[PDB]
Structure formats: structure tokens, C-alpha cells
Design an enzyme around this catalytic site. Structure first.
Site, PDB file in Angstrom:
ATOM      1  CE  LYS A  45      -1.983   2.257   3.957  1.00 50.97           C
ATOM      2  NZ  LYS A  45      -1.609   2.985   3.940  1.00 50.97           N
ATOM      3  CG  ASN A  46       1.546   3.193   3.094  1.00 52.44           C
ATOM      4  OD1 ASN A  46       1.149   3.406   2.833  1.00 52.44           O
ATOM      5  ND2 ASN A  46       2.274   1.966   4.516  1.00 52.44           N
ATOM      6  CG  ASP A  64       2.911   1.421   9.203  1.00 55.34           C
ATOM      7  OD1 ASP A  64       2.535   1.738  10.154  1.00 55.34           O
ATOM      8  OD2 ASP A  64       3.043   1.456   8.203  1.00 55.34           O
ATOM      9  NE  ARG A  77     -11.138   5.269   5.380  1.00 60.48           N
ATOM     10  CZ  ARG A  77     -11.257   5.701   5.951  1.00 60.48           C
ATOM     11  NH1 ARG A  77     -10.151   6.549   6.600  1.00 60.48           N
ATOM     12  NH2 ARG A  77     -12.256   7.010   5.705  1.00 60.48           N
ATOM     13  CB  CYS A  87      -4.442  12.120  13.120  1.00 59.61           C
ATOM     14  SG  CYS A  87      -3.699  10.379  12.701  1.00 59.61           S
ATOM     15  NE  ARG A 143       0.737  10.634  10.591  1.00 54.88           N
ATOM     16  CZ  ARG A 143      -0.084   8.835   9.801  1.00 54.88           C
ATOM     17  NH1 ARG A 143      -1.360   8.621  10.057  1.00 54.88           N
ATOM     18  NH2 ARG A 143       0.397   9.305   8.886  1.00 54.88           N
TER      19      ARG A 143
HETATM   20  C1  LIG Z   1       1.054   7.038   3.128  1.00 51.97           C
HETATM   21  C2  LIG Z   1       2.101   5.759   4.326  1.00 51.97           C
HETATM   22  O1  LIG Z   1       3.441   5.981   3.278  1.00 51.97           O
HETATM   23  N1  LIG Z   1       2.347   6.386   4.913  1.00 51.97           N
HETATM   24  C3  LIG Z   1       3.074   5.619   6.288  1.00 51.97           C
HETATM   25  C4  LIG Z   1       4.307   7.185   6.373  1.00 51.97           C
HETATM   26  O2  LIG Z   1       3.776   7.986   7.078  1.00 51.97           O
HETATM   27  P1  LIG Z   1       4.383   9.415   6.951  1.00 51.97           P
HETATM   28  O3  LIG Z   1       5.027   9.663   6.300  1.00 51.97           O
HETATM   29  O4  LIG Z   1       3.134  10.154   7.218  1.00 51.97           O
HETATM   30  O5  LIG Z   1       5.072   9.503   7.874  1.00 51.97           O
HETATM   31  P2  LIG Z   1       7.327   9.929   8.398  1.00 51.97           P
HETATM   32  O6  LIG Z   1       7.990   9.215   8.275  1.00 51.97           O
HETATM   33  O7  LIG Z   1       6.490  11.582   7.504  1.00 51.97           O
HETATM   34  O8  LIG Z   1       6.595  10.600  10.190  1.00 51.97           O
HETATM   35  C5  LIG Z   1       7.748   9.717  10.777  1.00 51.97           C
HETATM   36  C6  LIG Z   1       7.227  11.179  12.378  1.00 51.97           C
HETATM   37  O9  LIG Z   1       7.792  12.784  11.788  1.00 51.97           O
HETATM   38  C7  LIG Z   1       7.064  13.598  11.975  1.00 51.97           C
HETATM   39  N2  LIG Z   1       6.889  14.304  10.725  1.00 51.97           N
HETATM   40  C8  LIG Z   1       6.756  14.163   9.283  1.00 51.97           C
HETATM   41  C9  LIG Z   1       6.479  15.193   8.816  1.00 51.97           C
HETATM   42  C10 LIG Z   1       6.400  16.168   8.890  1.00 51.97           C
HETATM   43  O10 LIG Z   1       7.058  16.996   7.901  1.00 51.97           O
HETATM   44  N3  LIG Z   1       6.943  17.052   9.988  1.00 51.97           N
HETATM   45  C11 LIG Z   1       6.538  16.555  10.862  1.00 51.97           C
HETATM   46  O11 LIG Z   1       6.631  16.613  12.629  1.00 51.97           O
HETATM   47  C12 LIG Z   1       5.480  12.583  12.318  1.00 51.97           C
HETATM   48  O12 LIG Z   1       4.760  13.370  13.045  1.00 51.97           O
HETATM   49  C13 LIG Z   1       6.263  11.800  13.263  1.00 51.97           C
HETATM   50  O13 LIG Z   1       6.208  12.128  14.010  1.00 51.97           O
HETATM   51  O14 LIG Z   1       5.610   5.954   7.384  1.00 51.97           O
HETATM   52  C14 LIG Z   1       4.682   6.079   9.115  1.00 51.97           C
HETATM   53  C15 LIG Z   1       6.521   5.461   9.305  1.00 51.97           C
HETATM   54  O15 LIG Z   1       6.388   4.416   9.238  1.00 51.97           O
HETATM   55  C16 LIG Z   1       3.605   4.659   8.487  1.00 51.97           C
HETATM   56  O16 LIG Z   1       3.187   4.125   9.982  1.00 51.97           O
HETATM   57  C17 LIG Z   1       2.693   5.089   7.646  1.00 51.97           C
HETATM   58  O17 LIG Z   1       1.284   4.231   7.461  1.00 51.97           O
END
Ligand SMILES: CC(=O)N[C@H]1[C@@H](OP(=O)(O)OP(=O)(O)OC[C@H]2O[C@@H](n3ccc(=O)[nH]c3=O)[C@H](O)[C@@H]2O)O[C@H](CO)[C@@H](O)[C@@H]1O
Length: 419
Positions: free
Chosen positions: A22-23, A305, A397, A115, A120
Site C-alpha cells: 500500500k505504501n 506499522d 483502507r 489525527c 502529524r
Molecule cells: C502513506 C504512508 O506511506 N504512510 C506511512 C508513512 O507515513 P508518514 O509519511 O506520515 O510518516 P513520516 O515518516 O513522515 O513521520 C515520521 C515522524 O515525523 C513527523 N513529521 C513528518 C513529516 C513532517 O513534515 N513533519 C513531522 O513532524 C511525524 O509526525 C512522525 O512523528 O510512514 C509511517 C512510519 O513508517 C507509517 O506508519 C505510515 O503508515
């Protein structure tokens, strides 16, 4: 609103064929926005998030068709915004932003709100885009990006390891003028997949899978055919299903190398594991699992995950297991749900202390997390009696026909539609 009626206990045995990730399918579908020629993305799972992504793409004027593959034709993109109603059901919508600005000079995506699993923000995505020369404003709740002409490559150091921001920046950079370097990049297998998809289109990328990604921007991206890698989380989930039920399973269409941490922890829990080129076998030999200690962190550490799933394992294991969450600090909703089923645990800050019990009892529980909530369905498989999982759209989902796969493993599970 659907619900699962699960009758336990059941020893899970058999085979399961792993669906495309999915990712990886997600960021690749968004990246297809960059393609000037038709694209065929193979091995795409049939799940709600893909439906939403397809809808979003179509709303941009992209031609979309699907079966095992998803066919994309973005030659005629005529709309540049992702509306509130859609983004609210899928945070990943933010991924439309970068490709749009990079290719069309404009893009608007509704700013994701709150969320349940934690904070996030998408500050890093925005920062990255700005670093690339995009002008960004917030109007009526819409993040609006724009650039006159091409973006410009830049040397960017990530304040956090972010799967999402790495994808946003890497994707947009393929069309920028010059070289972009993403330092402290996320290393997830899905990042390597997306990068490879990009390269198949004509992009110039190296270092994907390491903490340093280098992109040399090109004029335009063509089209092509690309196969999405196997879903590591789906694989881990099935492996855990067998491990907590005294079962035996073989996962087909798997990629063992994306699972080192999880496999190692399963071994620690007492599982007998074998792997091949595209397969993973797990045999518990009818044994109850042994409690393990886990710490989630960016790949290739233990993934967040798989956290709920391992919490379940610990909850029915022998011993005291400890799970520490470093990615999503508030990702513990599954715990009180499991406690409704007879589990015992305490949450101290970002750590859950598990006191394994011999058997769970069936009860009414509520799904809330697209990946973690699968834990509830697994619990129902091994609990004594009937478990009813509400709000299963969450599971829909993130997993393709999970009841079907479970059923083929011996599970007693029914999709209940009558409300
Ligand atoms: C669609 C998808 O692929 N989703 C996955 C992706 O989500 P997702 O991309 O949202 O996760 P990130 O790796 O970006 O998030 C990691 C951490 O960094 C923080 N952060 C991230 C971006 C930003 O601009 N600012 C910030 O502060 C987030 O709040 C979190 O605490 O990686 C996560 C961690 O493996 C998985 O659990 C999600 O299922």
C-alpha cells in the site's frame, strides 16, 4: 457500516499471497502525475486508500483504470486541487502537492487536520518545496504552492527522518533544474520503490535506500510499466497471525529483505522461520509465544506499522514484554481495546508494559487505525468465543480482503453489513 464477527480460537495454517505494498503503490500513484506518457503500475492492492487515490487523480483530470494493475494517463491534467472531503479521509493526499507544482507550476492541497495517533504536521514537506523554489501560502485551509517556471535543485538537510517528506522532495526534484540532495532521508523500502519507479520514467536518482539521496533533475518524464514491491506490513501481520495461534504459514510473493527486524523478533518469540527468494515460512510448532522487547524506529529498525501486532503477541505471550514507540508517541489505542478482551498492560509515556495472559476472551471492540486495528481482528481469531470488530472500514483502507486471506488460513470470520 461494516463489522467483522470473529469466532475463536483458531490455529492459523496454510498459505497467503502477499499483495503489493500500500505504501509504495500510494507515492508511486502520486508520482505518476509527473508522467507525460501512459503508465501501468502492476501489483497494486485492492484497498480503500487506493480507491481514494484513484478518485483524487481523476479529480485532477487524470485518466484512471484498474483491474491487478492500475493504468494512469496524466497527459491531460486539467485541475490542480485535492479537496477537503478527500484529504480528510487520507493524509497521503499531501503527496499530490509536489508533483503538481513541479510539473504544472501550481498545486493546492487541503491542509491535513488532527489525527488520533499523534501530531502529524507536514511542515517538512512544505519546507522541502520552499527549498526547491516553490512559493507557499495557506488560504481557506488549502496549502497553495506555485512556481514560475521550473523548481531549482537544492541541498536539503531533514530535521526529522520522514518517509512522507522524503517522497515529496524526491518526487518534485526529478523535474527541477539542477541537482537536489536530500540529507537524512528516510530509507524505507517504499522510498527505494518510488525512486526506482521514477528512474523507470527517465528520472536520475541515486542513493535511494541510504540516508543520502541525490537527484539530477530532467526536462520531462515519460511513461512505462512498473511492478510494486510486496507489502512488508501485510506480510508481518500474517506472520504474527500464525505466531500467536500456534500455527504454520507460508507467505508467497514476499520480499524477506524488507523484514529483518520483524523476522528477528519473531525468532526471539520462538518461531521457526525459513526464507527463500520470494517466500517466508513460519512454524510455531503449536507453542505459545515468548514475550519480546521492541523499539519502533525508522527503517531498517522495527517498524511502527508492526507495533500493534507485536503488542498483541506480547499480550498472549509468556513473560513480560515491553514495547516502546519512538515514531507515533500516542499510537496506543489498540491497548485498551485488547484489555477489553482480557489482556493486561500499562502505558507509561511512549512505552507499553505487557503482562502476557494464557487466553483472550471475545468482546466488542472498535477499529480506529488503518494498520494497527488489524490487531483486533487477529485477537478475535485466537480469543475464546465471539469478537465483534466495529468500524472495519479502517482495516479496509489498509488491507486487501483481510477476511478472505484469514479465512483461507482457517479463520471463522464474517463481514457483517446489517448495521
Ligand atoms: C502513506 C504512508 O506511506 N504512510 C506511512 C508513512 O507515513 P508518514 O509519511 O506520515 O510518516 P513520516 O515518516 O513522515 O513521520 C515520521 C515522524 O515525523 C513527523 N513529521 C513528518 C513529516 C513532517 O513534515 N513533519 C513531522 O513532524 C511525524 O509526525 C512522525 O512523528 O510512514 C509511517 C512510519 O513508517 C507509517 O506508519 C505510515 O503508515
Amino acid at each position: 457500516m461494516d463489522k467483522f464477527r470473529v469466532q475463536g480460537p483458531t490455529r492459523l495454517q496454510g498459505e497467503v499471497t502477499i499483495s503489493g505494498a500500500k505504501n509504495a503503490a500510494l507515492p508511486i500513484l502520486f508520482a505518476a502525475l509527473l508522467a507525460e506518457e501512459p503508465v501501468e503500475i502492476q501489483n497494486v492492492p485492492k484497498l480503500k486508500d487506493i480507491d481514494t487515490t484513484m478518485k483524487l487523480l481523476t479529480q485532477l483530470g487524470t485518466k484512471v483504470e484498474r483491474x491487478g494493475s492500475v493504468w494512469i494517463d496524466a497527459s491531460n491534467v486539467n485541475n490542480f486541487s485535492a479537496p477537503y472531503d478527500l484529504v480528510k479521509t487520507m493524509r497521503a493526499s499531501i503527496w499530490a502537492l509536489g508533483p503538481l507544482v513541479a510539473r504544472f507550476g501550481q498545486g493546492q492541497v487541503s491542509l491535513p487536520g488532527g489525527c488520533a495517533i499523534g501530531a502529524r504536521p507536514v511542515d517538512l514537506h512544505i519546507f522541502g518545496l520552499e527549498k526547491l523554489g516553490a512559493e507557499i501560502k495557506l488560504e481557506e485551509g488549502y496549502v497553495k504552492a506555485s512556481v514560475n517556471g521550473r523548481l531549482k535543485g537544492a541541498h536539503i538537510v531533514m530535521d526529522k527522518v520522514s518517509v512522507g517528506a522524503t517522497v515529496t522532495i524526491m518526487s518534485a526534484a526529478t523535474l527541477a533544474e539542477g541537482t537536489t540532495i536530500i540529507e537524512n532521508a528516510a530509507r524505507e523500502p517504499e522510498i527505494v520503490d518510488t525512486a526506482n519507479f521514477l528512474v523507470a520514467l527517465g528520472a536520475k536518482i541515486s542513493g535511494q535506500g541510504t540516508d543520502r539521496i541525490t537527484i539530477e533533475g530532467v526536462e520531462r518524464l515519460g511513461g512505462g510499466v512498473y511492478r510494486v514491491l510486496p507489502d512488508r506490513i501485510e506480510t508481518g501481520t500474517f506472520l504474527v497471525a500464525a505466531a500467536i495461534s500456534g500455527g504454520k504459514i507460508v507467505c508467497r510473493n514476499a520480499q524477506p529483505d524488507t523484514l529483518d527486524a520483524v523476522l528477528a523478533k519473531l525468532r526471539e518469540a520462538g518461531a521457526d522461520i525459513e526464507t527463500g527468494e520470494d517466500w517466508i515460512s513460519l512454524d510455531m510448532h503449536g507453542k505459545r509465544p515468548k514475550a519480546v522487547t521492541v523499539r519502533t524506529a525508522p527503517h531498517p529498525a522495527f517498524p511502527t506499522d508492526m507495533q500493534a501486532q507485536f503488542t498483541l503477541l506480547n499480550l498472549v505471550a509468556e513473560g513480560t514484554g515491553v514495547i516502546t514507540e519512538t515514531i507515533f508517541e500516542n499510537r496506543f489505542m489498540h491497548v485498551p481495546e485488547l484489555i477489553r478482551m482480557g489482556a493486561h498492560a500499562e502505558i507509561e509515556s511512549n512505552t507499553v508494559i505487557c503482562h502476557g495472559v494464557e487466553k483472550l476472551s471475545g468482546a466488542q471492540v472498535m477499529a480506529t487505525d488503518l494498520r494497527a486495528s488489524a490487531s483486533l481482528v487477529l485477537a478475535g481469531c485466537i480469543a475464546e468465543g465471539t469478537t465483534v470488530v466495529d468500524r472495519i472500514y479502517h482495516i479496509d483502507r489498509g488491507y486487501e480482503r483481510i477476511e478472505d486471506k484469514l479465512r483461507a488460513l482457517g479463520a471463522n470470520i464474517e463481514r457483517v453489513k446489517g448495521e
